Amino acid sequence: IMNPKRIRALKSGKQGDGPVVYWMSRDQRAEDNWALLFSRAIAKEANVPVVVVFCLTDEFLEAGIRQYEFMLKGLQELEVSLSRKKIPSFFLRGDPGEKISRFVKDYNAGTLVTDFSPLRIKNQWIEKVISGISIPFFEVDAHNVVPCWEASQKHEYAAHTFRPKLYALLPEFLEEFPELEPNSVTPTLSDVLETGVKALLPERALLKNKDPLFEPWHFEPGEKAAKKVMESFIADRLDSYGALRNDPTKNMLSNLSPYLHFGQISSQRVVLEVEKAESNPGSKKAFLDEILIWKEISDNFCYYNPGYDGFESFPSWAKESLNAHRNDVRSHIYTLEEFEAGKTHDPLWNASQMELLSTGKMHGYMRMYWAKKILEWSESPEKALEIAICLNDRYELDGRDPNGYAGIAWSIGGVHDRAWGEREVTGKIRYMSYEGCKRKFDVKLYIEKYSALDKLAA
Template sequence: MDGRNIVPCWEASSKKEYAAYTLRPKIHRALPEFLKDFPLAQKHPFPWPKKVKKTNWDEAEISLKIDRSVPEVDWLLPGEKAAAATLDRFLTKKLSAYASRRNDPTEDGVSNLSPYLHFGQISAQRVALQLKKKKVNKESKDGFLEELIVRRELSDNFCFYNPDYDRFAGFPEWAQKTLNEHRGDKREYLYSLEQFEDGKTHDDLWNAAQMEMVHRGKMHGYLRMYWAKKILEWTGSPEEALEVAILLNDKYELDGRDTNGYVGIAWSVGGVHDRAWKERPIFGKIRYMSYGGCKAKFDVNSYIKHNLS
């Protein structure tokens, strides 16, 4: 059983897919079979004969083996009811402008559902069913469904069929080759894990993204790509970049330890689900992202001020 996805991973494809465009038609062909309303729950005919012991939530919380140095997040609440409220807020107030605002980190244009999806407090199927009922512009509706279904299931496909999903060996051959060819390239900046974690690089935009993740538990998706690519640029090897990015992502992101996180980092550092680009130092043919490119996309100064003040 695959309760995480709409189309079960092994039903969507029997192999590791090359990119979204190879999985997308398979997902769309399967949706009519799997994207259906949930059956009504039926009361069990036999009552439980024993008294259920009341849960001691304080003891349960103390028993958790977690890193308590991570700051507490207070901008969203956990649980099924909070997840439903977050979905309703997105559908009624944000969905119509999703296409135009989703890639701007200074706008509150995304759904903020990923933590709830990760912890199973709402299902992708329920989100998709609710969204399909809304009458909004096609670009926004299709764009969100692409992320919710195709891109999310593409990440599961990669991790399900690739045992090296979080290692250099999991990168496509062309990416391994080009990164190996540029291992000896001089790095203008090299930072330790502690410097990365504390947001102490020369790049205020990167530092702001790191601090957003540390204090908010959720970095904007567009900046997750820039963030990971700069770790590749400022560490001694692709392996070190992977280790640093995964450690920080899984420690601070509310939706960390998730296939989307591993694949997002692998896309940024190792060209997974991407193609070769113009060759350059350190990156080889891995897609490059720059500070200047971000400035052309959104108000960088506003983002930095908001997250570093």
């Protein structure tokens, strides 16, 4: 009734006599959620309530108000949603290692379930959780169509090597979601959102005139809005996606990534609705490849390379190339603070940084250019990786995500890419030029949208 290959037993023990607890982390949604659909089932077999617990930890100080409101507002909407299904929602504030471990005792949980995320630190918590628990601990991949550990069992070198593996399992894992059965066995935020903002308030990004840089109206948060972005994409942009996706002057991207990041929407549902949309094959194929292949190879990459954010996980050829050019003369070198405020010589580069700063979502094509000029105008790879990680995670609404580390590592160190012509500083890593951007899209339109803002920020 649910494909069991979505579950990995983490810790074995005695199904306690009490409620099943869904430890919610990556997939912050109440529909299309295999981990909550499993949680409700084991609850159903033992006639207990299902509760959901969410742990709010101090990592919000590492990013900004922009991500932190996007999250807390969905969770306000989420809590309403679960409670309509008789599912209470418990919000802890502290480190998951002990908050989830005491909660399991304090509530005499019968069973623990969590969703899957490949990032280092969730495995730390999990492991510290396992150490302090006695009831069983289960994990469900509710983020990938094909559960990450089943799609491939090794780091995948390239997309064309992972693509055939994935598409063989798709007939079996691409399926419809059953209906979340509300509890029969019947079992603060705002204040938590207000406290945070004032912690984050002195670090807000401000214009010269004390005005917030960020514009909070390009992406409304929530399960319900995420579905309506998915609906406008299928209605208005799926047809043109294939052809206009690399023009940053036309808003022809799905715009779905901030929601997928927080798991405010299942990518499986998107694949589902896209698959049945009558539109252009070139568009549907190009898109399915982004949301299936490139999204899930970025989980693959984080999962099988624990150092997914360091120089050391680049390919051998890439490292040998970059190191041989460590001593080449850089034509410009900017500090972190200099990129951050768009104060380089390159008005195209400055514009994309203006787009990141003020919308929280930079155009996907521009993201390659942005990051490769970072490698070109910093004093070393390591610093370039540093600066590019720190700004992608400070300011992208979709930041702090495996897709992040795996695209940074594409751009700077050639992971899941190949070797190209050898040049100074950047070695054999793929090159992108301003003149290349010019023949592809009207760069002066892009730069005009944002050049107004540069001299306004401080």
